[PDB]
Design a protein around this ligand. Structure first.
Ligand SMILES: CO[C@H]1O[C@H](CS(=O)(=O)O)[C@@H](O)[C@H](O)[C@H]1O
Length: 382
């Protein structure tokens, strides 16, 4: 009788279909979904509480790509002994291996992309922007042409959530800088990043309360036809093309714009399945994770939920690209996407950066003071 922790955000109703396929072929085994918070840091704060207390209730954990160092060092997961991760993208083999131990099996890949209203860019003769400067010029042109009070130029995540860590790093990496064995905090790129996110609000290109916007708020608002440009993850696509959308067939996907004279870098994301060290069904949990991390299930979740695959071959799979054409071009974006710090203290890293991003955008602290505070707090942790 297995229990799997899955975010309300990760389309548990589509995972439920994959569990039904498992139960149909595996007699005597039933799985039940326990849904968690929409955002990764909320899920993490929850799982820390129950893993700390050695709660045996949960069997399989859907964990963020940022979680293996913590969960490995805490002893919260049962390692996949003699497991070979070489069927999967090297980036996810690397994320799920801590001190030589296979901590987890990849569930799905992810990276940030620029979603855009191809109907509005096409109306105004605009190319997908390759720089943030080009994105500001396109936004002002479209907003002034459309005279739609509800149309946002750019939605990005400014809420004090895990996605705001990603937000902070996008311009930092585009400028060619790295955060880390040791912290190498570049003040100029850190301030440039916080100033850039603030500039969209100050220019009216982003709404005044972007500090309140989480991943699925960007998703909901873009889907309701209210956003020209959206920073999001692959899952949003299935929602954009579903039965409750204002933007069916009106959505382009591009790589993120670069900073003035930078690269079109992005943030690595994605999720993996861990088996709780406290599960009393280790054997059946492991067999369930082997199924859910299999190629066929990787393919099903790409087609049915726009979850980017963990297997290189699936990005150009006939049925995958028939369903989502832009997956065919997505592999090199995923394989070159920059990783957030690997550390067991990642909760503290996240808390420092996301609270600094949110405070800058809420007008609590200047971009310069925000960077100053972040460097001091990260110094202590890394
Ligand atoms: C929904 O997952 C995606 O977004 C997360 C941010 S949040 O939406 O949870 O704040 C990232 O951490 C994940 O790596 C990425 O796959």
């Amino acid at each position: 009788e297995l229990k799997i922790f899955v975010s309300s955000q990760h389309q548990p109703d589509i995972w439920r279909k994959a569990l039904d396929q498992y139960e149909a072929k595996t007699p005597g085994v039933k799985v039940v979904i326990e849904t968690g918070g929409n955002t990764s840091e909320m899920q993490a704060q929850y799982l820390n509480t129950v893993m700390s207390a050695k709660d045996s209730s949960l069997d399989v954990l859907m964990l963020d790509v940022i979680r293996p160092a913590q969960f490995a060092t805490a002893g919260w997961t049962s390692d996949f002994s003699g497991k070979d991760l070489s069927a999967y993208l090297p980036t996810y083999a690397e994320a799920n291996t801590v001190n030589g131990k296979i901590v987890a099996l990849p569930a799905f890949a992810d990276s940030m992309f620029l979603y855009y209203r191809k109907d509005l860019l096409d109306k105004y003769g605009i190319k997908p922007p390759t720089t943030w400067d080009e994105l500001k010029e396109a936004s002002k042109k479209v907003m002034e042409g459309e005279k739609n009070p509800e149309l946002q130029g750019l939605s990005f995540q400014g809420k004090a959530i895990e996605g705001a860590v990603c937000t902070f790093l996008l311009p930092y990496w585009s400028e060619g800088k790295s955060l880390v064995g040791k912290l190498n905090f570049d003040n100029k790129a850190a301030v440039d990043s916080l100033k850039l996110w603030k500039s969209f609000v100050d220019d009216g290109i982003s709404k005044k309360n972007i500090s309140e916007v989480a991943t699925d708020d960007t998703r909901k608002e873009f889907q309701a036809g209210k956003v020209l440009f959206a920073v999001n993850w692959s899952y949003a696509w299935t929602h954009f093309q579903g039965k409750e959308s204002q933007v069916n067939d009106k959505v382009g996907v591009a790589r993120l714009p670069a900073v003035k004279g930078g690269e079109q870098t992005t943030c690595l994301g994605g999720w993996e399945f861990g088996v709780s060290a406290y599960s009393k069904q280790q054997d059946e949990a492991k067999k369930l994770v082997e199924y859910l991390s299999s190629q066929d299930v990787s393919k099903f979740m790409a087609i049915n939920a726009a979850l980017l695959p963990t297997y290189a071959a699936l990005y150009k799979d006939a049925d995958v690209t028939k369903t989502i054409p832009w997956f065919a071009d997505a592999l090199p974006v995923v394989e070159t996407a920059k990783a957030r710090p690997v550390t067991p203290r990642y909760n503290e890293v996240s808390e420092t950066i996301r609270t600094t991003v949110n405070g800058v955008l809420a007008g609590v602290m200047t971009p310069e003071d925000g960077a100053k505070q972040m460097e001091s707090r990260l110094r202590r942790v890394l």
